[PDB]
């Protein structure tokens, strides 16, 4: 499986040293139910699954992770047992069975070929079945904080994303973990001196160092490999010292010698609407509490707004014609925007129509050159924003709350974070995003095309 | 050391001639003094390193004083490092600058030499010897000081500077206190103007009008109020007749604000206004002012949405002002709250559509003098670290112009420094160790980046930075209001009428003109058009004629040369008077005359495009010539500059630097990490000089800096701020270098397809083509050169007696036909008339040159008949010897075109039938030297036996040799390439030869290093040299691999660009100095294999306009059998 995982370029450059270390984590540094003695082997297998992909899936693209669940479970859940695919797979491959999404575990249980692909591939009228397996495929340490909280010898290979500041998350983790937030923005002699002495001090001190722009001063790697071993020992030197490697955006080729020794994890700035929403509320605390309290609610609206945008941003071209990185700085900005209109928002005097106009052309009206996209954000404003509490406007995500005299932290859950992921299962819902479902329907097949190809790719050894 | 003495000429030298220096080391300076009587006094002329060494008695007057220098430097270095610390302003300059500032500190004038970096937006100073009473804003308008200040060094330049600012500030707001009171009460603006500076007069007018609009926001008087400001417009429009250009401009800006009031009030007037909460005044900004403040830079509040910002009042005056479009407006609110987040921005859109203008608009709205950073330079972060201390000690607002075009080295290194600064901005941490000491970080600084639509929208900015930047999609601003309000404030009679017709004029043009990539007419251009309107009214600008005249002046010029009719016809469809001929008709006429003197036809298409040069000479800050070298791209510049100077009545201050043989570090400076400064390069030192002594002589002279290449952003992007509109270069240490109105940029190309329109479309372009010269036009040029042909031994009497058959051939269409027949056949180099007219006339005239001696005794007519074959040989060598014998033969069939003897029927053709010195001929039959190998060296390749094609090349070469030009031997090793080479470099002891190796990666320096052994230099008093290896004998340098040396990023053969200035210009830009140094008699020739072979190097079109070449592939079995 590892060998097939390693066909994913340098993303999966994890090798045999790590493989053995991975299994050492399986049998030692994971669960107490992985005792090698039989008959724990059934559970071991289930926990091999978990430990193996909790590192190996973090070294692979989500499209791999989706098919990893599908492929790998033949070994781990069914001890090498085949099963047959329906809907999308027939559409793009064949496999002699078709029945769509409306069908669950009904006529699925056939001989030789088991009910789970017969069930879940139905679901693949839109490719979501690869997550619907619910077959223990979840990264054990999926939380980047948990990635950090591992054995330090497995250094923090932060494989990030283009336009996404994964380093920022690490900065926040330094502060969250309360470790000496040191940052080395590699590129100068002074930064080489930081690579030299700043790290050397940290080796003793127990410092937390972000090797920002690890590729810009890549040549360090020439001796770094012995320094890898050295730093591993330095982690133990203070049981605090941690080293983070960051810069990787897209085509950043990382060395197998280190992927073989480090914790290879790809950063993913991919939150659903409510995921985005809830996190954004937590980040503001009291920005709209400052008199007038009507702006508290406005800050809550902005979290919903940005979140709808993060969905739309991902939907591009379905969403926006241009994929501008609308981020939580724009969200933060909007709360600052509110912070300023508190002069009017002391009560319902806030010119929320003016604010809507500004949400479209100030807050999220950034890189967008296309007037359509400016109109897209504007029609979202029309759809969502209003300068007060009790807004009976978008009940689809359930924004109609009376969250007035209480802040973004003070009573977040009370009326808003108590809500579940209020996202239409059959849509985006694109009426919130004011988008054409047609693209989703096209995505059904476009997904099937890529997925079909990737399952043929990986499945050979899984 | 001496190097320190040079840098320390100020402190050590100038502080002994004027010894006001810190006694700490002055006591050591006293020992210097005893000797500085020689090396500082004689150094009034003898200033540089070795030059100081050439000062009498330097043996101790330099060296002993160097020992004292060391004694001194031990604390002096740190003295000025601390003086530099004391003055944030000293971080905008180098230590040499500072060494001289303190060096002759008594001279308060020396201090004022750095005002562009020491002060804000201030023009000049109102002062007396060592005492000051007032100050001149960058506008030219003045503000006196609240109190007289003494300037002489005494009081301590730091204190002194602080005092200067204090009294200016006091005047800035104290007189402003009065200004508001006056306007708010209703005092006529003439009085208000008489008593104060406009940048804030307007601001207090806005405070008054804010109160007055609040009255109408309460629905007390929307119509009346609208009428009131409209009546105030009418009053000011009458007041525009005041002769003071600054004052009428002053109130034009006020009028624009009144027009904003007619717009905004008009909207409020025409809308159910929810008091100030209605976006028509909640979105639209408002102003407040507190006269009751002791801080004379902090009284006015800038407001909209729900925030008030503190206006700075940095002394500026009138200068810039943008129309308050809704897009500018949301730009301001975005910038504001981004500022409140302490986050930056990233503008994405072209200059002329607000790329920088809207940043500056906000800065002006804030009252700050924004430091615009032309980021395309060698901004080593160490140098910036110095600057960072200065700008953070102050709080300078940063505008980063083309930020992502700066090298990553710096970006990552600075991200360390600026992040600490950013952290301090967030925290409230003033003092931050910057450069080498705790620097009091001022919260006024902010980082807003701006680029013309970045290359394909690419995220060159690292995500660890980018996260905190909010983009500003400057696709466009509300140009409908920009254009109309500009025409309205202009007093343009058709500000609405013509404006609507302009929409339709450009509409028609867009539906008819071609989509030339070398063409643009957006708001950027429109701003140029808007600038043209009023003055074109005076230049025969009939109501609508005004803009179509402008549409003749700009936009069309750049468009393909066949679309002239598009503009004449489409503009006529709306308004019959579709522009006017170059009003300064005498200029395009003098141009024509210059071209006639140059031997070119000066076609009307050419002259018309040049009328557009003259039209845009006035209008555009930069122009791109597109076309043929010698017929457009270059002939335009060649001859329009002569009449250019006349067009404006200015000096023809034009420059041509071969930038592609100098590095960007050679040009803009290299890093000096030991000092944390960087060595100024050619262009950097020049541009610093532009702003400290060059424009002191060329303040109004017409300056055009010429770009000698196809677009290649590495030597183009640095100029973009000029092309944009900004017109500025800010250096690595904050040395802002503004580019003046008399400084324009002239590009020479035919192909800008090397980058994005983001930069191309920022400036004007004048399109030519090869249609500028027919072969007749090219011949008229050749003809004049044939009149002057060639060797001085030729009395030109013999020439006329022979050449007139050629002269007659020039008239013959059949000669034109052989130029097209050559084009129809395969040749090793591209057939170009600027090369072939030269090759043919050089071969022919040198054949004539040999006849100058022979012909003296030979019969005139008989020779006229003999040279019909001979001249045909030069025609059948120039346009045929450069290829395969069969292609040559096919070209030889064209032998029936020569005037003297039009016969295809010639047997052994003239290329074979060689003319002799006694009118006889010699048919070039096999000349393979049967009597050669008899014994001894039979198998030795060093003396290898030739063929008639290897011999032919030498026979042709002899006249190419007589011309002493660039002759290329083309053929593979052993074919004749090396066979001929062995013989060719041994042709005569008369010439010096050098078998130079040119591999793919052999530089001209590797070669030059060797050539320094093989060449000499007669250094002159001008710093110029000249001399071949031996005296007189031409240094026949031999390039053994002409088509092997690599091309650069865009296919430019930079090796040859150097070789051309070396040989064609007889000199070179000595890179270490960037010093042009001359050459005497060096002759560059060479060899190469067939360029048709895989992996061979292409020759530039303009190199094909000047290089000769001969061709032979591997030899025949017949000749090998012999």
Strand partners, B1109: B968
Query: How far away is chain B from the Cα of A208, in angstroms, using its nearest Cα?
Result: 16
Strand B967-970 and strand B1108-1111: the pairing is parallel
H or E element: which one contains B121?
A: none
Do residues A320 and A376 lie in contact, with contact meaning Cβ atoms separated by under 8 Å?
A: yes
Q: Looking at residue A164, what DSSP letter applies? A: B
Could A165 and B343 be called an inter-chain contact, meaning their C-beta atoms sit closer than 8 Å? no
H or E element: which one contains A50?
A: helix A41-56
Q: Does B985 touch chain A (CB under 8 A)?
A: no
Could B463 and A361 be called an inter-chain contact, meaning their C-beta atoms sit closer than 8 Å? no
Do residues B289 and B211 lie in contact, with contact meaning Cβ atoms separated by under 8 Å?
A: no
Q: Looking at residue B14, what DSSP letter applies? A: I
- Residues of B numbered 462-521 whose beta carbons fall under 8 angstroms of chain A's beta carbons: which are they? 462-464, 466-468, 470-475
Query: How far away is chain B from the Cα of A439, in angstroms, using its nearest Cα?
Result: 24
Those residues whose C-beta lies under 8 Å from the C-beta of residue A25, and which sit 6 or more positions away, are: A51, A151
Could A362 and B463 be called an inter-chain contact, meaning their C-beta atoms sit closer than 8 Å? no
Of B279, B408, B470, the CB nearest to A216: B408
Do residues B620 and B587 lie in contact, with contact meaning Cβ atoms separated by under 8 Å?
A: no
Count of beta carbons in the 10 Å neighbourhood of residue B155: 14
Whether residue B352 is annotated as binding a ligand: the answer is: yes
H or E element: which one contains B702?
A: strand B702-707
Please provide the DSSP assignment of A391-439 as one string.
-TT-TTTT------SS-TTTTHIIIIITS-----TTSS-HHHHT--THH
Q: Is B737 strand, coil or helix?
A: strand
Phi, psi of B995, deg, nearest 5: -75, 80
Q: For residue B305, is it left (φ>0), alpha (ψ between -120 and 50) or beta?
A: left
Strand partners, B1110: B969
Burial of A3 (0-12, 13-18, 19+ CB in 10 A): exposed
Burial of A139 (0-12, 13-18, 19+ CB in 10 A): middle
**CA nearest to B73, candidates B36, B25, B31, B34:** B25
Chain B residues closer than 8 Å to A162 by CB: 459, 463
Phi, psi of A331, deg, nearest 5: -60, -50
Could B278 and A186 be called an inter-chain contact, meaning their C-beta atoms sit closer than 8 Å? no
Could B334 and A163 be called an inter-chain contact, meaning their C-beta atoms sit closer than 8 Å? no
Of A325, A343, A367, the CB nearest to B348: A367
Count of beta carbons in the 10 Å neighbourhood of residue A406: 18
Do residues B6 and B49 lie in contact, with contact meaning Cβ atoms separated by under 8 Å?
A: yes
Q: Looking at residue B405, what DSSP letter applies? A: G
Q: Does B714 touch chain A (CB under 8 A)?
A: no
Count of beta carbons in the 10 Å neighbourhood of residue B556: 28
**CA nearest to B417, candidates A188, A216, A170:** A188
Could A351 and B349 be called an inter-chain contact, meaning their C-beta atoms sit closer than 8 Å? no
Of A163, A337, A361, the CB nearest to B463: A163
Chain A residues closer than 8 Å to B471 by CB: 324, 366-368
Strand partners, B440: B431
H or E element: which one contains A181?
A: strand A181-183
Distance CA A207, CA A334 (A): 35
Could A344 and B282 be called an inter-chain contact, meaning their C-beta atoms sit closer than 8 Å? yes
Sheet with B1082-1088, side-by-side order of all strands: B992-996, B1035-1039, B1082-1088, B967-970, B1108-1111
Resolution (A): 10.5
- Residues of B numbered 260-279 whose beta carbons fall under 8 angstroms of chain A's beta carbons: which are they? 274, 277-279
CB pairs under 8 A between A and B: 144
Whether residue B140 is annotated as binding a ligand: the answer is: no
Please provide the DSSP assignment of B530-546 as one string.
HHHHHHHHHTT--TTHH
Whether residue B413 is annotated as binding a ligand: the answer is: no
Q: Looking at residue B628, what DSSP letter applies? A: B
Q: Does B955 touch chain A (CB under 8 A)?
A: no
Whether residue B973 is annotated as binding a ligand: the answer is: yes
Distance CA A228, CA A262 (A): 9
Closest residue of B to A190, CA-based?
A: B413
Could A187 and B413 be called an inter-chain contact, meaning their C-beta atoms sit closer than 8 Å? yes
Do residues B917 and B850 lie in contact, with contact meaning Cβ atoms separated by under 8 Å?
A: yes
H or E element: which one contains A62?
A: helix A62-76
* E strands in B775-927: 913-915, 921-923
Distance CA A163, CA B459 (A): 7
Those residues whose C-beta lies under 8 Å from the C-beta of residue A78, and which sit 6 or more positions away, are: A114
Distance CA B854, CA B336 (A): 87
Chain B residues closer than 8 Å to A345 by CB: 306
Those residues whose C-beta lies under 8 Å from the C-beta of residue B951, and which sit 6 or more positions away, are: B924, B927
Those residues whose C-beta lies under 8 Å from the C-beta of residue A337, and which sit 6 or more positions away, are: A355, A358, A359, A362, A363, B305, B333, B337
Do residues A277 and A310 lie in contact, with contact meaning Cβ atoms separated by under 8 Å?
A: no
Could B349 and A216 be called an inter-chain contact, meaning their C-beta atoms sit closer than 8 Å? no
Please provide the DSSP assignment of A236-301 as one string.
HHHT--EEEEE---SS----HHHHTTSEEEE------HHHHHHHHHHTTTTTTTSS-THHHHHHHH
Closest residue of B to A349, CA-based?
A: B277
Closest residue of B to A326, CA-based?
A: B470
Three state DSSP letters for B557-621: CCCCCCCHHHHHHHHHCCCCCCCCCCCCHHHHHHHHHHHHHCCCCCCHHHHHHHHHHHHHHHHCC
Distance CA B777, CA B378 (A): 46
Could A165 and B463 be called an inter-chain contact, meaning their C-beta atoms sit closer than 8 Å? yes
Distance CA B406, CA B404 (A): 5
Q: How far is CA B107 from CA B14, B118, B134, B706, in A?
A: 11, 15, 18, 38
Those residues whose C-beta lies under 8 Å from the C-beta of residue B708, and which sit 6 or more positions away, are: B656, B657, B658, B659, B660, B748
Strand B1075-1078 and strand B1067-1070: the pairing is antiparallel
**CA nearest to B1064, candidates B708, B721, B636:** B708
Whether residue B23 is annotated as binding a ligand: the answer is: no
H or E element: which one contains B427?
A: helix B408-427
Query: How far away is chain A from the Cα of B311, in angstroms, using its nearest Cα?
Result: 17
The experimental technique used to determine this model is cryo-EM
Distance CA A155, CA A109 (A): 45
Chain A residues closer than 8 Å to B419 by CB: 183, 185
**CA nearest to A130, candidates A89, A79, A75, A82:** A89
Whether residue B631 is annotated as binding a ligand: the answer is: yes
Crossing angle of helices B63-86 and B381-394, rounded to 10°: 50
- Residues of B numbered 657-696 whose beta carbons fall under 8 angstroms of chain A's beta carbons: which are they? none
Distance CA A397, CA B618 (A): 61
Do residues A178 and A268 lie in contact, with contact meaning Cβ atoms separated by under 8 Å?
A: no
In total, chain A counts a number of residues equal to 462
Q: B156-187: b or e for each residue (b if 16 or more CB lie within 10 Å)? A: ebeebbebbeebbbebbbebbbbbbebbbeee
H or E element: which one contains B370?
A: none
Chain B residues closer than 8 Å to A213 by CB: 412, 462, 464
Distance CA B301, CA B295 (A): 13
In total, chain B counts a number of residues equal to 1122
Could A337 and B413 be called an inter-chain contact, meaning their C-beta atoms sit closer than 8 Å? no
Distance CA B85, CA B73 (A): 17
Q: Does B190 touch chain A (CB under 8 A)?
A: no
Those residues whose C-beta lies under 8 Å from the C-beta of residue A227, and which sit 6 or more positions away, are: none
Query: How far away is chain B from the Cα of A345, in angstroms, using its nearest Cα?
Result: 9
Torsion of CA B955, B956, B962, B963, to 10 degrees: -170
Distance CA B290, CA B299 (A): 5
């Amino acid at each position: 499986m590892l060998e097939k995982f390693g066909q994913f370029h340098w993303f999966y450059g994890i090798s045999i040293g790590q493989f053995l270390s991975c299994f050492k984590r399986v049998f030692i540094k994971k669960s107490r139910e992985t005792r090698a003695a039989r008959t724990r082997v059934d559970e071991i297998l289930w926990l091999l699954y978990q430990e193996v992909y909790c590192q190996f899936s973090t070294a692979l693209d989500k499209k791999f992770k989706m098919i990893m669940a599908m492929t790998m479970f033949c070994l781990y859940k069914f001890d090498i047992e085949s099963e047959q695919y329906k809907e999308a797979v027939l559409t793009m491959i064949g496999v002699l069975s078709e029945s769509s999404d409306g069908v669950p575990k009904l006529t699925v249980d056939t001989n030789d070929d088991l009910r789970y692909l017969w069930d879940y591939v139905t679901t693949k009228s839109y490719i979501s079945a690869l997550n619907w397996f619910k077959n223990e495929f979840f990264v054990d340490e999926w939380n980047i904080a948990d990635v950090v909280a591992n054995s330090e010898n497995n250094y923090f290979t932060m494989a990030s994303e283009r336009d996404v500041d994964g380093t920022f998350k690490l900065i926040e983790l330094a502060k969250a973990s309360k470790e000496s937030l040191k940052i080395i923005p590699l590129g100068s002699i002074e930064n080489l001196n930081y690579a030299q002495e700043e790290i050397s001090k940290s080796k003793i001190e127990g410092g937390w160092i972000l090797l920002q722009n690890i590729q810009m001063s890549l040549s360090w790697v020439k001796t770094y490999l012995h320094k890898h071993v050295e730093e591993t020992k330095a982690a133990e030197e203070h049981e605090k010292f941690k080293m983070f490697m960051t810069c990787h955006l897209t085509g950043d080729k990382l060395p197998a010698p280190l992927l073989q020794r480090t914790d290879r994890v790809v950063y993913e700035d991919i939150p659903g609407i409510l995921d985005t929403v809830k996190d954004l509320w937590g980040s503001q605390f009291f920005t709209g509490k400052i008199s007038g309290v009507w702006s508290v609610y406005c800050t809550f609206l902005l979290s919903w707004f940005h979140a709808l945008i993060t969905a739309r941003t991902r939907l591009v071209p379905h969403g926006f014609s241009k994929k501008y990185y609308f981020n939580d700085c724009d969200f933060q900005f909007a709360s600052v925007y509110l912070e300023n209109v508190l002069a009017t928002n002391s009560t319902n005097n806030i010119p929320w129509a003016q604010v809507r106009d500004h949400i479209a052309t100030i807050v999220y009206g950034g890189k967008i050159d296309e007037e359509k996209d400016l109109e897209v954000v504007a029609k979202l404003c029309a759809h969502v924003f209003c300068g007060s509490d009790n807004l009976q406007i978008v009940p689809g995500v359930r924004i109609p709350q009376p969250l007035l005299q209480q802040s973004e932290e003070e009573e977040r859950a009370r009326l808003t974070a108590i809500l579940s992921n209020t996202i239409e299962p059959a849509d985006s819902l694109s009426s919130w995003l004011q988008l054409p479902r047609e693209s989703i329907l096209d995505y059904e097949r476009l997904q099937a095309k890529e997925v079909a190809s990737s399952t043929e790719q990986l499945l050979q050894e899984m | 050391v001496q190097f320190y003495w040079l840098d320390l000429y100020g402190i050590l030298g100038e502080n002994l001639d004027i010894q006001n220096f810190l006694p700490l080391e002055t006591s050591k300076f006293k020992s210097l003094t005893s000797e500085y009587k020689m090396i500082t006094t004689r150094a009034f002329q003898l200033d540089t390193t070795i030059e100081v060494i050439h000062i009498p008695n330097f043996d101790t007057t330099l060296k002993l004083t160097i020992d004292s220098l060391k004694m001194i430097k031990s604390s002096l270095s740190t003295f000025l490092e601390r003086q530099r610390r004391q003055f944030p302003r000293f971080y905008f300059l180098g230590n040499d600058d500072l060494l001289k500032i303190i060096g002759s500190g008594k001279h308060h004038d020396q201090v004022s030499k750095f005002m562009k970096k020491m002060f804000g937006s201030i023009e000049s100073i109102i002062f007396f010897e060592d005492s000051i009473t007032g100050v001149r804003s960058v506008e030219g308008e003045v503000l006196n000081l609240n109190e007289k200040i003494e300037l002489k060094d005494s009081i301590q330049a730091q204190e002194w500077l602080n005092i200067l600012d204090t009294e200016i500030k006091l005047s800035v707001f104290t007189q402003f206190r009065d200004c508001l009171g006056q306007l708010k009460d209703g005092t006529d603006i003439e009085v208000v103007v008489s008593k104060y500076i406009f940048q804030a007069i307007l601001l207090s007018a806005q405070v008054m009008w804010t109160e007055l609009v609040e009255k109408c926001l309460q629905t007390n008087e929307f119509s009346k109020y609208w009428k009131e400001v409209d009546m105030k417009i009418k009053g000011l429009l009458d007041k525009l007749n005041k002769s003071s250009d600054n004052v009428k401009k002053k109130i034009e800006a006020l009028l624009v604000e009144y027009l904003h009031f007619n717009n905004v009030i008009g909207q409020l007037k025409n809308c159910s206004t929810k008091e100030e909460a209605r976006l028509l005044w909640a979105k639209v900004q408002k102003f407040y002012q507190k006269n009751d403040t002791l801080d004379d830079l902090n009284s006015v509040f800038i407001s909209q949405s729900g925030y008030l910002l503190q206006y700075k009042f940095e002394y500026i005056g009138i200068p810039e002002r943008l129309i308050y479009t809704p897009l500018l407006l949301v730009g301001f609110a975005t910038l504001t709250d981004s500022l409140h987040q302490k986050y930056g921005g990233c503008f994405f859109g072209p200059a002329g559509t607000g790329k920088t203008e809207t940043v500056k608009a906000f800065g002006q709205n804030l009252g700050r003098v924004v430091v615009v950073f032309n980021c395309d330079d060698s901004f080593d972060y160490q140098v910036l670290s110095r600057l960072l201390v200065g700008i953070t000690q102050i709080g300078a607002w940063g505008c980063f112009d083309e930020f992502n075009r700066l090298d990553e080295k710096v970006l990552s290194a600075v991200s360390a420094n600026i992040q600490q600064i950013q952290n301090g901005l967030q925290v409230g941490k003033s003092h931050i160790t910057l450069l080498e000491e705790e620097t009091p970080l001022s919260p006024h600084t902010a980082v807003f980046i701006t680029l013309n639509p970045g290359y394909n929208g690419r995220s060159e900015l690292p995500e660890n930075l980018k996260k905190s930047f909010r983009e500003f999609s400057m696709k466009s601003p509300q140009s409908g209001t920009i254009a109309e309000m500009i025409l309205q404030i202009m007093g343009f009679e058709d500000s609405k009428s013509l404006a609507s017709k302009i929409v339709h004029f450009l509409e028609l043009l867009s539906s008819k003109c071609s989509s030339m990539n070398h063409y643009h007419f957006g708001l950027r251009t429109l701003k140029g058009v808007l600038r043209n309107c009023s003055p074109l009214v005076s230049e025969f600008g009939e109501g609508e004629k005004t803009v179509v005249e402008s549409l003749k002046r700009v936009i069309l010029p750049s468009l393909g040369d066949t679309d002239e009719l598009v503009f004449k016809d489409e503009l006529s469809k709306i308004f019959d008077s579709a522009g006017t001929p170059l009003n300064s008709k005498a200029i395009v006429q003098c141009l024509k005359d210059a071209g006639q003197r140059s031997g070119f036809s000066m076609s009307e298409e050419f002259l018309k495009k040049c009328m557009q040069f003259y039209y845009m000479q006035k209008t555009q800050q930069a122009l791109i010539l597109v076309g043929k070298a010698g017929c457009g791209k270059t002939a335009t510049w060649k001859t329009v500059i002569d009449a250019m100077a006349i067009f404006d009545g200015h000096a023809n201050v034009v420059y041509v630097i071969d930038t592609k043989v100098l590095t960007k570090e050679s040009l803009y400076g290299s890093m000096l990490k030991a000092t944390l400064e960087w060595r100024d390069g050619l262009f950097t030192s020049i541009l610093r000089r532009v702003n400290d002594d060059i424009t002191g002589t060329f303040k109004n002279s017409r300056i055009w800096v010429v770009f000698d290449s196809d677009l290649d952003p590495e030597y183009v992007e640095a100029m973009n701020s000029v092309l944009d509109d900004n017109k500025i270069l800010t250096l690595p240490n904050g040395e802002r270098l503004p580019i003046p109105p008399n400084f324009r940029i002239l590009f020479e190309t035919d192909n800008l397809d090397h980058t994005t329109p983001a930069t191309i479309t920022r400036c004007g372009l004048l399109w030519f083509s090869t249609d500028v010269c027919s072969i007749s036009s090219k011949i008229d040029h050749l003809l004049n050169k044939s009149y002057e042909a060639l060797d001085n031994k030729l009395s030109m009497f013999e020439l006329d007696k022979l050449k007139d058959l050629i002269s007659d051939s020039f008239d013959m269409a059949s000669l034109t036909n052989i130029f097209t027949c050559s084009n129809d056949l395969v040749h090793i180099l591209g057939v170009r008339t600027f090369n072939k007219l030269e090759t043919a006339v050089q071969l022919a005239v040198h054949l004539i040159s040999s006849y100058r001696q022979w012909f003296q005794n030979l019969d005139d007519k008989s020779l006229k008949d003999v040279i019909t074959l001979l001249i045909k040989r030069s025609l059948l060598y120039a346009l045929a010897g450069d290829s395969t014998g069969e292609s040559q033969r096919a070209f030889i069939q064209t032998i029936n075109t020569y005037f003297g003897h039009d016969s295809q029927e010639l047997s052994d053709y003239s290329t074979i039938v060689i003319a002799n010195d006694k009118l006889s001929f010699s048919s070039f039959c096999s000349e393979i030297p049967s009597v050669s190998l008899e014994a001894h060296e039979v198998m030795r390749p060093d003396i290898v036996i030739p063929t008639i094609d290897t011999i032919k090349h030498e026979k042709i070469f002899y006249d190419l040799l007589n011309s002493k030009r660039g002759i290329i031997l083309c053929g593979p090793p052993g074919s004749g390439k090396t066979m001929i080479m062995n013989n060719a470099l041994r042709n005569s002891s008369l010439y010096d030869v050098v078998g130079i190796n040119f591999s793919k990666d052999t530089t001209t320096e590797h070669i030059l290093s060797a050539l320094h052994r093989h060449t000499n230099y007669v250094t002159t008093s001008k710093g110029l040299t000249l001399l071949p290896k031996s005296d007189i004998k031409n240094l026949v340098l031999f390039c053994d691999e002409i088509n092997l040396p690599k091309l650069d990023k865009y296919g430019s053969q930079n090796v040859v660009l150097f070789l051309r200035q070396l040989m064609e210009k007889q000199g070179f830009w000595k890179t270490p100095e960037n010093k042009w140094v001359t050459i005497e008699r060096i002759h560059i020739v060479g060899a190469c294999n067939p360029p048709t072979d895989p992996g061979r190097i292409p020759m530039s079109e303009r190199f094909t306009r000047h290089a000769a070449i001969l061709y032979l592939g591997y030899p025949s079995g017949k000749s090998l059998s012999q």
